Scaffold this active site. Structure first.
Site, PDB file in Angstrom:
ATOM      1  N   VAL A 226       0.805  -1.215   0.000  1.00 43.28           N
ATOM      2  CA  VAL A 226       0.000   0.000   0.000  1.00 43.28           C
ATOM      3  C   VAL A 226       0.840   1.268   0.000  1.00 43.28           C
ATOM      4  O   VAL A 226       0.291   2.351  -0.254  1.00 43.28           O
ATOM      5  CB  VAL A 226      -0.999   0.024   1.177  1.00 43.28           C
ATOM      6  CG1 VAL A 226      -2.114  -0.989   0.941  1.00 43.28           C
ATOM      7  CG2 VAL A 226      -0.298  -0.257   2.483  1.00 43.28           C
ATOM      8  N   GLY A 227       2.142   1.186   0.254  1.00 41.40           N
ATOM      9  CA  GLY A 227       2.984   2.365   0.164  1.00 41.40           C
ATOM     10  C   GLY A 227       4.393   2.070   0.620  1.00 41.40           C
ATOM     11  O   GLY A 227       4.684   1.024   1.207  1.00 41.40           O
ATOM     12  N   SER A 228       5.277   3.025   0.343  1.00 37.72           N
ATOM     13  CA  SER A 228       6.668   2.911   0.759  1.00 37.72           C
ATOM     14  C   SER A 228       7.268   4.310   0.839  1.00 37.72           C
ATOM     15  O   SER A 228       6.603   5.314   0.567  1.00 37.72           O
ATOM     16  CB  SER A 228       7.463   2.011  -0.193  1.00 37.72           C
ATOM     17  OG  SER A 228       8.080   2.766  -1.221  1.00 37.72           O
TER      18      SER A 228
ATOM     19  N   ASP B 286       0.467   9.075  13.541  1.00 38.49           N
ATOM     20  CA  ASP B 286       1.666   9.693  12.946  1.00 38.49           C
ATOM     21  C   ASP B 286       2.273  10.763  13.846  1.00 38.49           C
ATOM     22  O   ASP B 286       2.510  11.902  13.429  1.00 38.49           O
ATOM     23  CB  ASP B 286       1.367  10.278  11.563  1.00 38.49           C
ATOM     24  CG  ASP B 286       1.290   9.222  10.489  1.00 38.49           C
ATOM     25  OD1 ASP B 286       1.372   8.022  10.826  1.00 38.49           O
ATOM     26  OD2 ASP B 286       1.136   9.595   9.308  1.00 38.49           O
TER      27      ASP B 286
ATOM     28  N   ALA C  65      11.158   6.508   2.520  1.00 38.51           N
ATOM     29  CA  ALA C  65      12.419   6.421   3.251  1.00 38.51           C
ATOM     30  C   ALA C  65      12.244   5.725   4.597  1.00 38.51           C
ATOM     31  O   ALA C  65      13.195   5.135   5.119  1.00 38.51           O
ATOM     32  CB  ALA C  65      13.007   7.818   3.448  1.00 38.51           C
TER      33      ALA C  65
ATOM     34  N   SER D 239       8.353   0.284   4.338  1.00 38.46           N
ATOM     35  CA  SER D 239       7.275  -0.115   3.442  1.00 38.46           C
ATOM     36  C   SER D 239       6.101  -0.629   4.261  1.00 38.46           C
ATOM     37  O   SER D 239       6.280  -1.134   5.371  1.00 38.46           O
ATOM     38  CB  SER D 239       7.727  -1.199   2.450  1.00 38.46           C
ATOM     39  OG  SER D 239       9.072  -1.008   2.048  1.00 38.46           O
TER      40      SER D 239
HETATM   41  C1  LPZ Z   1       1.563  -0.357  10.898  1.00 39.94           C
HETATM   42  C2  LPZ Z   1       2.051   1.050  10.906  1.00 39.94           C
HETATM   43  C3  LPZ Z   1       2.540   1.606  12.091  1.00 39.94           C
HETATM   44  C4  LPZ Z   1       2.996   2.916  12.117  1.00 39.94           C
HETATM   45  C5  LPZ Z   1       2.961   3.661  10.948  1.00 39.94           C
HETATM   46  O1  LPZ Z   1       3.410   4.971  10.907  1.00 39.94           O
HETATM   47  C6  LPZ Z   1       3.030   5.739   9.791  1.00 39.94           C
HETATM   48  C7  LPZ Z   1       4.233   5.858   8.861  1.00 39.94           C
HETATM   49  O2  LPZ Z   1       5.163   5.077   8.896  1.00 39.94           O
HETATM   50  N1  LPZ Z   1       4.263   6.927   7.918  1.00 39.94           N
HETATM   51  C8  LPZ Z   1       3.041   7.676   7.633  1.00 39.94           C
HETATM   52  C9  LPZ Z   1       3.422   9.150   7.335  1.00 39.94           C
HETATM   53  N2  LPZ Z   1       4.446   9.234   6.187  1.00 39.94           N
HETATM   54  C10 LPZ Z   1       4.936  10.677   6.065  1.00 39.94           C
HETATM   55  C11 LPZ Z   1       5.648   8.313   6.430  1.00 39.94           C
HETATM   56  C12 LPZ Z   1       5.148   6.881   6.764  1.00 39.94           C
HETATM   57  C13 LPZ Z   1       2.476   3.128   9.742  1.00 39.94           C
HETATM   58  C14 LPZ Z   1       2.018   1.812   9.734  1.00 39.94           C
END
Ligand code: LPZ
Ligand code: LPZ
Ligand code: CL
Ligand code: CL
Ligand code: CL
Ligand code: CL
Length: 342
Positions: A26-28, A161, A30, A33
């Site tokens: 569903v996304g990746s 987040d 830095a 993933s």
């Molecule tokens: C299972 C899980 C646990 C924690 C997560 O934290 C969200 C994340 O890593 N980001 C969202 C915001 N983006 C800018 C970078 C990526 C995500 C999934």
């Protein structure tokens, strides 16, 4: 220990317990993933994140520990919680990879944002209920914005987040539009009142359908802010600690605070009153999350017996100096001690 199985999805190896099925990317980025999956043990659709380079430096290793500590602490209806954490490693010596599991979130507020006043009451109520919990543990979110608020089909909301580069904060970017003026130019160190500024910016946008302060750069954004809330008065100027802030702000022509009833035309007078109490330039004087829950705007939803506080959160590690392998061993201990929710 569960049995693990391996697969390659978009050039990355995933080794996960058999309970997790039908993995799909569903996304990746830095950070790592993320895959959606079906958890056969709970029946939930879940998000599984594989961290990328979790122990590549001291900064990276400490950040991995920080994320796991924060996610393990969160236990509240309006905050993301941790369903599972695992590693395929059988010992500290072969420990390298960390996987985090949460409920799979659908839409965020960016997608939802026709919002009636009743919808705004319920959405902002839930943000403030979650923030009362977070702030009671002396945690600051620091990055509240619509893309960090998940919402389901029944208008139910979770905060997620919980560092951004200098390039990420440059120009006409939503990554800066919700930030309090005292942190945007680093006039001041963070404190929990910065999150209430963000809530005011989000609430205004839900009422109007438009960004409140869409600045094209840091300086343009400050000018938009000061036009609405006024330039600092004698009382606040006396309290400003940064000298270069003082000198630049004093170069601007003075402006009075505007009439919010003429800015937010047609809005509930109780919504206007609450916005005036969140969007105060002097952060000492802003309403707190606990105070805002008792404001008359939320009369339909406020229940002081169902707005819980958090267990204490020890973040003494934040001022600790450790080696990479010491941060790694602390992280390993937190992985193997995880206890799932009932
Ligand atoms: C299972 C899980 C646990 C924690 C997560 O934290 C969200 C994340 O890593 N980001 C969202 C915001 N983006 C800018 C970078 C990526 C995500 C999934
Ligand atoms: C006393 C009061 C209570 C609730 C209110 O919510 C706004 C509203 O109901 N409007 C519907 C009509 N539109 C033209 C503007 C938005 C407004 C005033
Ligand atoms: Cl399993
Ligand atoms: Cl959750
Ligand atoms: Cl591993
Ligand atoms: Cl703790």
């Amino acid at each position: 220990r569960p049995t693990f199985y391996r697969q390659e999805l978009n050039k990355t190896i995933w080794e996960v317990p058999e309970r997790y099925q039908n993995l799909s990317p569903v996304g990746s980025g830095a950070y790592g993933s993320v895959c959606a999956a079906f958890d056969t043990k709970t029946g939930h659709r879940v998000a599984v994140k594989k961290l990328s380079r979790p122990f590549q430096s001291i900064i990276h290793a400490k950040r991995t520990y920080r994320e796991l500590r924060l996610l393990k602490h969160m236990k509240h209806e309006n905050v993301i919680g941790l369903l599972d954490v695992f590693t395929p490693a059988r010992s500290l010596e072969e420990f390298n990879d960390v996987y985090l599991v949460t409920h799979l979130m659908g839409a965020d507020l960016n997608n939802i944002v026709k919002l009636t006043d009743d919808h705004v009451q319920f959405l902002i109520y839930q943000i403030l209920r979650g923030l009362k919990y977070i702030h009671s543990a002396d945690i600051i979110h620091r990055d509240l914005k619509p893309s960090n608020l998940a919402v389901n089909e029944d208008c139910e909301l979770k905060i997620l987040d919980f560092r951004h580069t200098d390039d990420e904060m440059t120009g006409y970017v939503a990554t800066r539009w919700y930030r309090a003026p005292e942190i945007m130019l680093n006039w001041m160190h963070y404190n929990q009142t910065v999150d209430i500024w963000s809530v005011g910016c989000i609430m205004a946008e839900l009422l109007t359908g438009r960004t409140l302060f869409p600045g094209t750069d840091h300086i343009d954004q400050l000018k938009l802010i000061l036009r609405l809330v006024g330039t600092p008065g004698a009382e606040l100027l006396k309290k400003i600690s940064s000298e270069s802030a003082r000198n630049y702000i004093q170069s601007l022509a003075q402006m009075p605070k505007m009439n919010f009833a003429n800015v937010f035309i047609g809005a509930n007078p109780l919504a206007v009153d609450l916005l005036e109490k969140m969007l105060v330039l002097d952060s000492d004087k802003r309403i707190t999350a606990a105070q805002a829950l008792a404001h008359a705007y939320f009369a339909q939803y406020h229940d002081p017996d169902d707005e819980p506080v958090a267990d204490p959160y020890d973040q003494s590690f934040e001022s600790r100096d450790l080696l990479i392998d010491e941060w790694k061993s602390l992280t390993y201990d937190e992985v193997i001690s995880f206890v799932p929710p009932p």
